[PDB]
Curated annotation (Swiss-Prot):
Region named PIWI domain: 425-682
The PAZ domain, residue ranges: 165-256
Spans annotated as Linker L1: 106-162
Protein name: Protein argonaute
Group of enzyme by EC: hydrolase
Region called PIWI box, residue ranges: 588-626
């Protein structure tokens, strides 16, 4: 009844003797995780952090003081002796200690090397003028169940990386370095390139210093070479990454995303393939760690069940029908909620009397639905090939005209390019592919298109009848910032305020200047003053969905602005990346769940359509009066507010597209301050 990457993990050590280390100085949050790493390096025995005390697994002979040196340059001293271990207090401690065992027993290294021996041939992809490898990454995190047992969350993903180094690459040809996600060899880290400069620019002691300040071994050895090898040092580059971390171009390998696409889509794997592989990885950990006192359950943790949600939607006349794939029937007969009876549309065709026949049928379908499209201007473009990305650049730049919608007929980076540009100008866009009319049944395309054009223009086809829970507004936020050295430069906030019936009340997109705490606070106070501007009286229930992880600062701002305006707040974090997957043959997984400790739930938000393409989200109730199951049902109901009946959308309307829109506005030159009531991104 639905399996997951979760296995009951347990630790019952033989030699229960542990050496404690406490600093003679203070506590430094960001640095605590770095010290713990270094305590494990100098000692050689697995370590965990119990508040201030650094507990180490075993006996270190003659141990007095530990003089670990951090990245900063700050030296840290710590001493003390023994105490006997009686289980863990956190999942964090379990993970910290478990991980160091995988390292010291080199079992993840034996695996990586044994997976290359049989699979090197399969792992490699070749093209004309370039060669790529699909490097395996095994990420383990220790979670805690509802009941209280620790779960080893174990997955296997494939990191797409070129054979060539970032140095070999920067040497040959000068391609745009910034925003390129890179990763150091023996390091579990990925960051985006900020600054590139020559190693000639720095003298002898820099390399020796940055070597003495290097956290891992491959980096000690990379700085050792630039210092000791002058052939290298001259032609070498040093790369500064996002958070600050400086690494030599010599140990940096680029990380790729996006025929290569075809041969690299075998990486999606069948659910049986990851599951049996994860099952193969587990077995090796148990050989390597049973003697050390570790147990890992061979059996996956099964999901609890299906969470029903209110999927019933209705039109302007009030026709009710449950949404399982949204009837074509319902969308044929439905009367929309008209926001603009008459519309101004621009059209574009990328060609080499079907498009025309279709456009006419569209116009008619919608006319008989109350909305009339009035064509402002047909822009016909003539392709041969790619020369068009240029011949399309020209008409797109001028398309701000006053258009309500833009319909484009194309003959995949094509769809992607066009939508992004019309997203920047904030003009709703419907990109009809010529391949779609050729391949699908014209009525379904007409319907697929109908439902979507209606949503984009505020003339929504339907809205939910009931959402479980008496909540007065659903606000979804993502705040994306631009990092330059240390303190925040540019920032964009995108808020989406919704109804108890799921309809869009207002959105708010603003770019914010450079100030410390006044950023987070203004961004969230602005959100609050907007709710006030929208007539939300004192004591109204407000559910907030955060696209990312709610930073401590944000959680704060909310609670205080919740106190200030007298609102009943519910704060949810919506984590889409690196969650425990669901393995089963059910194919109708929407609503499936596994429940964790601090009211966190691994949830299936959409049904399995394409193979291996199933990413469950992790919903966390950071702050809240309502149960997670209730909040989860509302998330599930709001997925339907994305008006994509023929296609699936993983995210609730409150956060769907929120992270893509903010990161886009950041790449701007001008700041925004816009408010609307149109779902222009769809
Ligand atoms: Ca973000």
């Amino acid at each position: 009844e639905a399996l997951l990457n979760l296995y009951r993990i347990e630790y019952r050590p033989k030699d229960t003797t542990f050496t404690v280390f406490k600093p003679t100085h203070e506590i430094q949050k960001e640095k605590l995780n770095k010290v713990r790493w270094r305590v494990f390096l100098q000692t050689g025995l697995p370590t965990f952090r119990r508040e201030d005390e650094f507990w180490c697994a075993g006996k270190v002979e003659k141990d007095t003081l530990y003089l670990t040196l951090s990245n900063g340059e700050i030296v840290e001293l710590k001493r003390v002796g023994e105490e006997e271990f009686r289980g863990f207090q956190n999942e964090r401690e379990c993970q910290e200690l478990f991980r160091d065992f995988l390292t010291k027993t080199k079992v993840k290294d034996k695996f990586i090397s044994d997976f290359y021996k049989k699979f090197r041939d399969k792992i490699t992809v070749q093209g004309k003028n370039r060669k790529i490898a699909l490097i395996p990454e095994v990420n383990e995190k220790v979670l805690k169940s509802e009941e209280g047992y620790f779960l080893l969350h174990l997955d296997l993903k494939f990191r797409i990386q070129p054979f060539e180094t970032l140095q070999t690459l920067l040497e040959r040809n000068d391609f745009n370095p910034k925003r390129i996600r890179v990763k150091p060899i023996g390091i579990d880290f990925v960051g985006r390139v900020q600054d590139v400069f020559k190693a000639k620019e720095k003298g002898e002691e820099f390399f020796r210093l940055c070597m003495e300040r290097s956290t891992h071994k491959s980096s000690k050895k990379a700085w050792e070479e630039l210092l000791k090898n002058r052939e290298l040092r001259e032609k070498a580059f040093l790369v500064v990454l996002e958070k600050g971390y400086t690494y030599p171009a010599t140990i940096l390998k680029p990380v790729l995303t996006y025929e290569r696409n075809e041969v690299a889509d075998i990486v999606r794997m069948e659910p049986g393939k990851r599951l049996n592989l994860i099952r193969y990885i587990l077995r090796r950990y148990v050989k390597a760690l049973r003697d050390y006192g570790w147990y890992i359950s061979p059996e996956e943790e099964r999901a609890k069940g299906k969470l029903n949600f209110k999927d019933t939607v209705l039109d302007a006349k009030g026709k009710n029908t449950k949404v399982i794939t949204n009837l074509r029937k319902f969308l044929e007969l439905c009367r929309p909620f008209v926001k603009k009876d008459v519309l101004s549309v621009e059209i574009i065709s990328v060609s080499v009397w079907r498009k025309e026949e279709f456009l006419k049928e569209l116009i008619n379908f919608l006319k008989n639905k109350g909305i009339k499209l009035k064509i402002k201007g047909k822009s016909l473009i003539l392709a041969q090939t790619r020369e068009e990305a240029k011949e399309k650049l020209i008409p797109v730049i001028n398309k701000i005209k006053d258009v309500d919608l833009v319909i484009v007929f194309l003959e995949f980076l094509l769809y992607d390019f066009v939508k992004r540009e019309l997203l920047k100008k904030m003009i709703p866009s419907q990109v009809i592919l010529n391949r779609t009319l050729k391949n699908e049944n014209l009525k379904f395309v007409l319907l697929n298109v109908a439902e979507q054009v209606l949503a984009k223009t505020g003339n929504i086809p339907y809205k939910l009848k009931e959402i479980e829970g008496k909540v007065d507004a659903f606000v979804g936020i993502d705040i994306s910032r631009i990092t330059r050295d240390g303190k925040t430069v540019n920032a964009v906030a995108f808020t989406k305020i919704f109804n108890s019936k799921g309809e869009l009340v207002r959105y708010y997109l603003t770019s914010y200047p450079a100030f410390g705490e006044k950023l987070t606070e203004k961004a969230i106070g602005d959100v609050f003053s907007l709710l006030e501007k929208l007539g939300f009286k004192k004591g109204s229930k407000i559910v907030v969905h955060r696209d990312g992880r709610l930073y401590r600062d944000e959680v704060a701002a909310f609670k205080k602005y919740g106190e200030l305006y007298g609102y009943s707040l519910e704060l949810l974090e919506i984590i889409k990346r690196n969650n425990p997957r669901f393995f089963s043959n059910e194919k109708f997984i929407k609503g499936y769940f596994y429940k964790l400790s601090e009211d966190s739930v691994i949830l299936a938000t959409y049904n399995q359509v394409y193979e291996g393409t199933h990413q469950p989200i992790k919903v966390r109730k950071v702050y809240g009066e309502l149960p997670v199951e209730v909040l989860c049902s509302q998330i599930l109901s709001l997925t339907l507010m994305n008006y994509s009946s023929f296609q699936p959308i993983k995210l609730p309307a409150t956060v769907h597209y929120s992270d893509k829109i903010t990161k886009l506005m950041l790449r701007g030159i001008e700041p925004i301050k816009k408010e609307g009531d149109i779902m222009y991104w769809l």
